[PDB]
Amino acid sequence: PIVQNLQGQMVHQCISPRTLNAWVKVVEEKAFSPEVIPMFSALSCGATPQDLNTMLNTVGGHQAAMQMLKETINEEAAEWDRLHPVHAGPIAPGQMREPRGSDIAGTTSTLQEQIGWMTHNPPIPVGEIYKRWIILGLNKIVRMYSPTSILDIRQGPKEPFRDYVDRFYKTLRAEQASQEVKNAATETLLVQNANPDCKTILKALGPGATLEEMMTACQ
Amino acid sequence: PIVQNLQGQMVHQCISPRTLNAWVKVVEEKAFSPEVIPMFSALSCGATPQDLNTMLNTVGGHQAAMQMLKETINEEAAEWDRLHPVHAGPIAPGQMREPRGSDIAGTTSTLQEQIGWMTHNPPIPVGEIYKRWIILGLNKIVRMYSPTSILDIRQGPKEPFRDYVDRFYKTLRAEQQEVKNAATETLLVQNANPDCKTILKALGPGATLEEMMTACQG
Amino acid sequence: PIVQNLQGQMVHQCISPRTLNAWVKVVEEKAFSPEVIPMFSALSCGATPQDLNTMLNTVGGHQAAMQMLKETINEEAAEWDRLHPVHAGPIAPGQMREPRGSDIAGTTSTLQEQIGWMTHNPPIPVGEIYKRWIILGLNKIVRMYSPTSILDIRQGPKEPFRDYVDRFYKTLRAEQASQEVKNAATETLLVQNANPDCKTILKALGPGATLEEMMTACQ
Amino acid sequence: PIVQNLQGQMVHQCISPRTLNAWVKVVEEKAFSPEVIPMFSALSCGATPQDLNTMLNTVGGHQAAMQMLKETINEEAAEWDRLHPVHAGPIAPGQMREPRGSDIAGTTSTLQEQIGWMTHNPPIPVGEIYKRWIILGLNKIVRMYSPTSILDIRQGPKEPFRDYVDRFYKTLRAEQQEVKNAATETLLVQNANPDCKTILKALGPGATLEEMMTACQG
Amino acid sequence: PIVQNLQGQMVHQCISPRTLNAWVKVVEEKAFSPEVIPMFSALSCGATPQDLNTMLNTVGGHQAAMQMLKETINEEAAEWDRLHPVHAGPIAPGQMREPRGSDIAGTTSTLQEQIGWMTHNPPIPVGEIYKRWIILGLNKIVRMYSPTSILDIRQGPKEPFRDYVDRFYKTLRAEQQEVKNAATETLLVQNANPDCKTILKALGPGATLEEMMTACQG
Amino acid sequence: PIVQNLQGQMVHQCISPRTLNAWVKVVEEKAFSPEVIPMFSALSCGATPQDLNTMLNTVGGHQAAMQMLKETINEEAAEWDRLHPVHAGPIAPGQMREPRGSDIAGTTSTLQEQIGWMTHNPPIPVGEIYKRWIILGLNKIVRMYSPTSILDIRQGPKEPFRDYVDRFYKTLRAEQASQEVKNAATETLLVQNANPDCKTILKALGPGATLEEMMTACQ
Ligand SMILES: CC(C)(C#Cc1ccc(-c2ccc(Cl)c3c(NS(C)(=O)=O)nn(CC(F)(F)F)c23)c([C@H](Cc2cc(F)cc(F)c2)NC(=O)Cn2nc(C(F)(F)F)c3c2CCCC3)n1)S(C)(=O)=O
Ligand SMILES: CC(C)(C#Cc1ccc(-c2ccc(Cl)c3c(NS(C)(=O)=O)nn(CC(F)(F)F)c23)c([C@H](Cc2cc(F)cc(F)c2)NC(=O)Cn2nc(C(F)(F)F)c3c2CCCC3)n1)S(C)(=O)=O
Ligand SMILES: CC(C)(C#Cc1ccc(-c2ccc(Cl)c3c(NS(C)(=O)=O)nn(CC(F)(F)F)c23)c([C@H](Cc2cc(F)cc(F)c2)NC(=O)Cn2nc(C(F)(F)F)c3c2CCCC3)n1)S(C)(=O)=O
Ligand SMILES: CC(C)(C#Cc1ccc(-c2ccc(Cl)c3c(NS(C)(=O)=O)nn(CC(F)(F)F)c23)c([C@H](Cc2cc(F)cc(F)c2)NC(=O)Cn2nc(C(F)(F)F)c3c2CCCC3)n1)S(C)(=O)=O
Ligand SMILES: CC(C)(C#Cc1ccc(-c2ccc(Cl)c3c(NS(C)(=O)=O)nn(CC(F)(F)F)c23)c([C@H](Cc2cc(F)cc(F)c2)NC(=O)Cn2nc(C(F)(F)F)c3c2CCCC3)n1)S(C)(=O)=O
Ligand SMILES: CC(C)(C#Cc1ccc(-c2ccc(Cl)c3c(NS(C)(=O)=O)nn(CC(F)(F)F)c23)c([C@H](Cc2cc(F)cc(F)c2)NC(=O)Cn2nc(C(F)(F)F)c3c2CCCC3)n1)S(C)(=O)=O
Ligand SMILES: [Cl-]
Ligand SMILES: [Cl-]
Ligand SMILES: [Cl-]
Ligand SMILES: [Cl-]
Ligand SMILES: [Cl-]
Ligand SMILES: [Cl-]
Ligand SMILES: [Cl-]
Ligand SMILES: [Cl-]
Ligand SMILES: [Cl-]
Ligand SMILES: [Cl-]
Ligand SMILES: [Cl-]
Ligand SMILES: [Cl-]
Ligand SMILES: [Cl-]
Ligand SMILES: [Cl-]
Ligand SMILES: [Cl-]
Ligand SMILES: [Cl-]
Ligand SMILES: [Cl-]
Ligand SMILES: [Cl-]
Ligand SMILES: [Cl-]
Ligand SMILES: [Cl-]
Ligand SMILES: [Cl-]
Ligand SMILES: [Cl-]
Ligand SMILES: [Cl-]
Ligand SMILES: [Cl-]
Ligand SMILES: [Cl-]
Ligand SMILES: [Cl-]
Ligand SMILES: [Cl-]
Ligand SMILES: [Cl-]
Ligand SMILES: [Cl-]
Ligand SMILES: [Cl-]
């Protein structure tokens, strides 16, 4: 990663063995459950493109998902090149060359160049741009590897309402979209798919009931 | 988090893999027992709103509780907005814009803006404000996920007094001061078994818990 | 905790996850054996009142003991207030308000105030004062949760003297008092409660025998 | 390794016990799976040739692979010597002698000489040059220890398409761009089972892997 | 402990949770085997008397041994007092009072006084003086808890010579130089079995242990 | 160990508990397999003679090997004294006394003296000299505790060539000597002791075949 030293300088630091192992283990244990995305974002805090590639490369298995990840990265790289065409010319002593999409992804850039972009004034955060592309691709994988659809989450006749809401929002979380779309699913399905006993109790509470109030009434 | 380096400067630091792992494991092992709140508060020491969102996001399962958490955060965010009406105008070179409720919660603010507020002079501690909202919401979850009421904790006829007081105060802690002193000293005696109850009335009012527990050991 | 940086300044540091976990685990594994007190004192090295409350709050179970701990803290807090009545008046720019008993215990003081007291010149060590109260209460719990009394430690007819002395001082350690009282128990009971074979051997050694000499003679 | 301290100076640091243990364990658990190469590259971040030799030396077993590694290193060392003919002469007070192939590999150079080259201005990065040779040799071992050829990866008649693509690209990664794109998009379809193959021809050319995998889920 | 920071200053540092845990575990697993002494000495590197008391206090069980340890410490403390008679008088602004035996042992001295002695110029190393007393007492415990005498270590008629020498020197280490050389070279041969003994007399005096072990492999 | 601080000064640092435990564990798990030597060298990076003695002393068991280690150290210490006779005379304010062999081994020198030698300008690296002697003795133990001789490594009639080469170089590695002697064993035995099918294939490849080429042809 790029961390701050004691002189106000942003300097490169080696990725720690604990960080490497933590990322490998979370993929091993959780596959592509939704909580793997925050794990990846935090473990790649301040990462260079090289560090991001290191983390993705150390993943064992799930190579179909990782290949989909590469395709998403290339799409974002192609879009970046269309939005930032490079301007030919000799690079000045101080400055650094403009980064292409393949430079952000770390395929055509060295670590020294990645450090130069990230520690520049103002910084060009190729690590955060690359991380955005990876997380975009990881969100697609979480979508695809989700076993259940939100329309199939129905409360059982003897299932506690808390367990039903657990399944509802677990399923809703794996279908990543805007909150306007997640609030729409809730207002469309959560009460309507509760079991008959709890459904009649919640409709009397009215639409203005909080989840806390809904869960309290169906205890 | 935002911590002091070895030379007195407030700088941003990445949340450590040990901190992330510790928080994930304690929720996995303890769910929403009362001791999860101090663990969260300590593990989020110096956290930015982004760190707090990271920690809450790494929680697997318990999405009903975590959704209740979002609603509590939105309630506190709305109250913050009502108490701090925004003043329109261009931001001066040095200062930073005043934060809204969604900025404290980290949904409409960048990490750099959060660092700017927290390292400002004087600091706007958006991380501690957000953490206050989260702990408020986590406390609601603990109280709701408490299975037993203090009125149902009664000492068995052959149950050691120590084990009964363990269960009593464990339950009282989950049933989240004016009433916690109310349960103590009078509900505790009333729900003791007849054998220990008779010993405790002889002690008279003003007995410490140590004196109460010593008198009912045998 | 409050640690020293590289400029001679005492600054606040976050309690580490390793420290939190270590304290939780030692309570889980050892309950209130006597060695939990040194574990707590070392793990709370340099702790603020907030850190001390964090450690006590993270304890799962043993809530009867922890409630006795609160009562001991309130007694010491009440005594501190009786010995240090606060003097009303506006606090000067540099100085800090005088700490009440509830401020030392962290119930009416902020972390910022605790840092101010502990890093003041001269420091008011509210963390060490609070720690004294907690350890006082923890010593009472170790006393109460000790299963055996020193008068019941008697050497068996075939029990090795070393195992008997192990039980003797293990029991004596859980009854915390002054060493004058622990030397009294030893001079009153250790030889007198050895089995007949070793007892007759030790009485011939005389009162001036060291424990090493006593254990060597009864091997 | 040679890392920057908290004040901008390039100083030598001892390889940590965690780094040593991590490298030993990953070889123990993963042998020469493709993901062992990124692990080695990251764990040897900033390494001197001595650190690289330490890491390779701590490997227990697999001495046939490790001997192949030595031969690859010697081949690259010989090429370095042919491209950098040595210039005889006394070394000036300030500078350092030019490194031979065996100096980069750490067999004829001391740790102090390696520090001198790596911290020179401009630096002679003997650690990264050596690491390049090692990873080149490790890549040869991975390819040789790959059990299956990409031509033998065919989807079973009842095998889920996801599992088939997992095996396909796992195998393709061990079979170490002009031909890796060649297997993709046409070998992948050709080795699918008749049921999914018929769906994939209807998608037409230009289908992404996401579109291919979505179409053969059921 | 009292360690140097990253800038040359001797400052107090809290004993780490890893150091505490390591010491507790080694006593739990190894009791008072001889290798417990080096572990204690290394784990107490730079320790104050308070740290040393902390480490000894965290030991669970073995209270007979730990009481023998206290008596040894008191013996050394009394000898220190006899060798350093106290000089009455008011302490000057700069200096520190001379330490008694109980001050070195940490029973009558505060942590701040211990820091003052250890960071003084010249330093009064109360931590290393105390540690010397503790290791002296720990050595007495190891010797007392050694089950076997060197005279009872004899090679079996079919026991490999290597295993016999392992047991011989393991026992000799617990039986805590003038006599340790005495057991070596002549007791070692005398307690070998007749088969290896006959080989070792043919080697003649002056044989190294390597030569002795090589000659009795088969 | 002796590490560099932030002022360019080489200062003493305590040996870490992780380093102590790692060395103890590797001896417990690997005994005296050849890879224990690199483990020891890396874990003793920058070690003082005191640290080296600490690591050797913490070894449980294998006391015959450790005694052979002491004898090797004394031989090297005696040779050092013969090559560096000490010159009597008062030590100047700045300088330090010349180290004897027993000073390098840490038996007659204090930690303060070891720090003085190692941080001197120019440094007298007693830690690296001692480490050389220990590794010399450790190499002798790996030799002696090797169960197999290189002449007994013969490929089985159905044994894969890769497994045979694994055994060959594992055995060759435990007999530590110069590479000229290890290249001699390879050119004398590796092809000659392959099974008849692979042996005839390799002899046709000729002596100029690499190991990669030899292993590919006998797959
Ligand atoms: C970098 C990473 C790790 C990230 C992130 C991130 C950023 C902001 C927020 C967030 C914070 C507070 C509030 Cl108040 C809202 C809100 N308020 S609102 C209009 O009412 O919805 N929106 N959002 C999310 C949106 F970005 F829009 F600002 C809020 C979050 C929250 C944090 C959180 C998690 C938690 F567990 C409980 C909380 F209290 C807060 N995380 C999510 O909300 C993810 N989530 N998704 C669903 C879904 F899909 F099931 F509905 C559910 C959840 C959480 C649990 C209930 C259901 N994270 S990242 C991603 O890049 O890797
Ligand atoms: C930030 C977090 C981590 C926090 C906190 C915090 C702050 C102050 C105190 C505290 C300290 C000392 C005393 Cl004297 C009182 C007291 N004195 S009083 C009139 O009698 O009430 N009050 N309180 C708490 C109140 F806020 F009120 F000021 C006291 C605490 C205490 C610390 C503690 C824990 C412990 F284990 C044993 C102790 F000795 C001290 N923690 C609690 O007391 C929690 N607790 N609750 C109940 C209940 F509800 F069952 F009674 C019980 C307990 C503990 C076990 C017995 C029963 N923590 S956090 C979480 O916000 O994230
Ligand atoms: C401080 C410690 C840890 C050390 C060391 C050290 C120093 C240099 C080298 C080294 C580096 C690169 C090349 Cl090119 C050669 C070479 N080139 S050459 C003429 O063709 O032979 N020689 N040597 C070794 C010699 F010192 F001479 F410079 C080379 C080494 C190598 C590192 C290595 C290990 C590995 F696993 C694979 C590699 F690619 C490189 N380690 C060894 O070679 C040990 N080894 N021994 C035998 C034997 F005995 F079976 F043949 C075998 C091996 C390695 C595996 C195959 C067989 N380490 S230490 C010791 O003090 O604790
Ligand atoms: C130093 C070490 C650790 C390294 C490295 C490294 C460098 C660059 C890239 C990389 C990044 C993004 C893209 Cl877009 C491309 C691309 N775009 S392209 C035209 O389609 O090929 N190429 N490459 C790699 C090439 F060098 F070519 F530039 C890309 C990588 C990627 C990182 C990665 C891994 C992942 F898991 C998922 C990702 F999204 C990105 N790693 C690989 O791709 C390895 N890999 N190989 C194959 C193969 F062979 F089976 F196809 C497959 C994979 C990954 C899983 C699918 C199949 N690492 S190292 C080791 O040297 O020590
Ligand atoms: C902060 C914490 C962790 C503390 C402490 C502390 C302070 C001083 C001493 C201490 C040091 C050396 C000597 Cl010479 C004496 C002595 N000399 S004397 C008159 O002859 O008795 N007194 N004391 C104790 C007294 F404070 F008075 F100065 C001595 C201690 C000792 C350390 C120790 C432990 C050990 F294991 C073996 C040792 F060699 C030394 N610890 C104890 O002694 C506790 N202990 N108690 C009993 C009892 F009850 F069974 F007798 C026994 C023991 C130890 C084992 C034998 C029996 N710790 S804390 C608490 O706040 O958490
Ligand atoms: C502070 C602590 C941790 C210590 C220490 C320490 C100091 C010096 C030495 C040492 C170093 C090298 C040599 Cl050459 C001699 C030697 N040369 S000589 C005439 O032959 O005796 N003497 N001694 C030790 C004596 F103090 F005497 F100067 C030597 C040691 C050695 C280190 C060591 C350990 C090892 F495992 C193998 C080695 F190569 C070197 N440790 C011992 O030797 C302990 N030991 N004891 C016996 C006994 F008793 F059974 F013979 C045996 C052993 C080791 C295994 C064989 C038998 N440690 S501490 C604890 O105080 O807390
Ligand atoms: Cl690490
Ligand atoms: Cl890269
Ligand atoms: Cl989830
Ligand atoms: Cl509920
Ligand atoms: Cl820092
Ligand atoms: Cl970490
Ligand atoms: Cl971790
Ligand atoms: Cl955020
Ligand atoms: Cl509880
Ligand atoms: Cl009780
Ligand atoms: Cl930590
Ligand atoms: Cl507090
Ligand atoms: Cl005990
Ligand atoms: Cl005994
Ligand atoms: Cl540093
Ligand atoms: Cl480490
Ligand atoms: Cl480790
Ligand atoms: Cl080397
Ligand atoms: Cl793979
Ligand atoms: Cl799929
Ligand atoms: Cl420091
Ligand atoms: Cl630690
Ligand atoms: Cl720990
Ligand atoms: Cl003390
Ligand atoms: Cl031993
Ligand atoms: Cl042998
Ligand atoms: Cl450590
Ligand atoms: Cl030493
Ligand atoms: Cl090997
Ligand atoms: Cl092969």
Numbering used by the authors:
A (entry chain A), C (entry chain A), F (entry chain A): 1 to 219
B (entry chain B), D (entry chain B), E (entry chain B): 1 to 176, 179 to 220
Copy out sentences from the published article reporting this entry, exactly as the authors wrote them.
The cyclopenta-pyrazole (R4) ring of LEN appears to be a good target for modification due to its close proximity to the Q67H substitution. Specifically, our structures indicate steric hindrance between the closed conformation of the His67 side chain and the cyclopropyl moiety of the cyclopenta-pyrazole ring. Therefore, we replaced the R4 ring with a tetrahydroindazole ring, which also eliminated the cyclopropyl group and the two fluorine atoms present in LEN, resulting in KFA-012. This modification would allow for the R4 ring to be more flexible and, accordingly, less sensitive to the Q67H substitution. Next, we have determined an X-ray crystal structure of the cross-linked CA(WT) hexamer in the presence of KFA-012 at a resolution of 2.27 Å. When bound to the cross-linked CA(WT) hexamer, the modified ring of KFA-012 did not display complete 2Fo-Fc density, which supports the flexibility of the cyclohexene ring. The elimination of the cyclopropyl group on the R4 ring appears to leave more space for the ring to maneuver within this site of the binding pocket. The increased flexibility afforded by the modified ring of KFA-012 could in turn account for its enhanced potency toward HIV-1(Q67H CA) and HIV-1(Q67H/N74D CA). Consistent with this notion, KFA-012 exhibited an approximately 2-fold improved binding affinity to the CA(Q67H/N74D) hexamer and a similarly enhanced potency with respect to HIV-1(Q67H/N74D CA), compared with the parental compound.
